[PDB]
Amino acid sequence: VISPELEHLDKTLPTMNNLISQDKRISSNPVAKIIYGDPVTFLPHLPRKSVVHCSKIWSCRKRITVEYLQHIVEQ
Amino acid sequence: LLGTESRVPELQGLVTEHVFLLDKCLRENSDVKTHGPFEAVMRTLCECKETASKTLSRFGIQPCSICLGDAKDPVCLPCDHVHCLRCLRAWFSQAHREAIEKHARFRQMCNSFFVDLVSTICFKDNAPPEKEVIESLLSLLFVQKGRCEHTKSLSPFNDVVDKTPVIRSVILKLLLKYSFHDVKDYIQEYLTLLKKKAFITEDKTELYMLFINCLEDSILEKTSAYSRNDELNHLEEEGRFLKAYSPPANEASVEYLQEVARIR
């Protein structure tokens, strides 16, 4: 009964994160926008002279471990 | 050979011959990291292929020039050809599809052999290959097909191509097995070739993220083998770099991407 949710995470989690970022509780929280949105929309000092200077470049990148590899092997 | 020994045995014979010929083409200059033997192996492979083709086919197994790829689920015309009905219908019995499957299998396994060789015997040292070898390997990722360039997986063959360009990262993972200082020129050449009119059009953020992830992985790979004192020396050197680091319109050279990965 559980596994289907583990399979659909990749599409159910972004929805949850968007809802969390949009809730008025932290919608205006700068750290929330940073973690979920693009801080260029509320931070003017962010250099925007290059293509490297983008949030996607500076987005967190999941580290690879033996456990993630095991999960992939299983999936 | 062993694979083909199970799925398409009719070609075992040919194969077991070319095997020796391979043994014979690398018998005097086995430095496959050079131009001569590398081109020799590529030729031998295209010939093992191309003759599996000439023998499996009745007249020819050429892919569909209109699908711009393998003529899968094709129909044999009376026009001395085999084509998918859809394409040349817009333009206006399983022997052939079993044969197409067999040839696709042979090609897949020959490509597997080529990549395994290039990764284990052509990229295996504390030094890199020569210039011509890297240039040929890079050019093997691009094809000006008859009609328009196209990207294909690393393979000497020109029959399997990616219709919508797919900028993979296989040559970079290998080139980065060594110190960036030597392979930076080749990485920059690859980045220029890709960013060129060839495939990429605009908003190349994804290609940059690709190079960045590759370099980060190379660095983590080189630092994982560091011991305690090696680790603390790496820490001190990273601190020195951060202390001395400081700063090309809408364009990211490979050095910038390396600094990005490093500070990340």
Place this chain on the structure above:
Amino acid sequence: DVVKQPGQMDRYLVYGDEYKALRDAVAKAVLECKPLGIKTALKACKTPQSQQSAYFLLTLFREVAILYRSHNASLHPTPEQCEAVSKFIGECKILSPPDISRFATSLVDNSVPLDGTVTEMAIHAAAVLLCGQ
């Protein structure tokens, strides 16, 4: 320009914006102590009665029980809020069962089974088990 100045995440939002509606509804309801728009919100939820009870419990925890954890004595649910929501639970038609109503009246009055993430997960599990079929 970031460190110049506070809400918190509500993971239960995974249940849909129906839960968000019921949540802010019970929130303002406690803030106003004329709770029947909470009844209209409950009427609005289209999910089954068990899911409605789970939503009710989660919202009560998010807007009342959590407030007790606060070192801020300013927003501790004052007695009028407690009696209002307790009356509502006593008259509710979907919390009529004894265990669910007990857990809800525990959430309102900070007498529940007692870290933040662990507490949230435990309360969610408790609601799921109480209302789960």
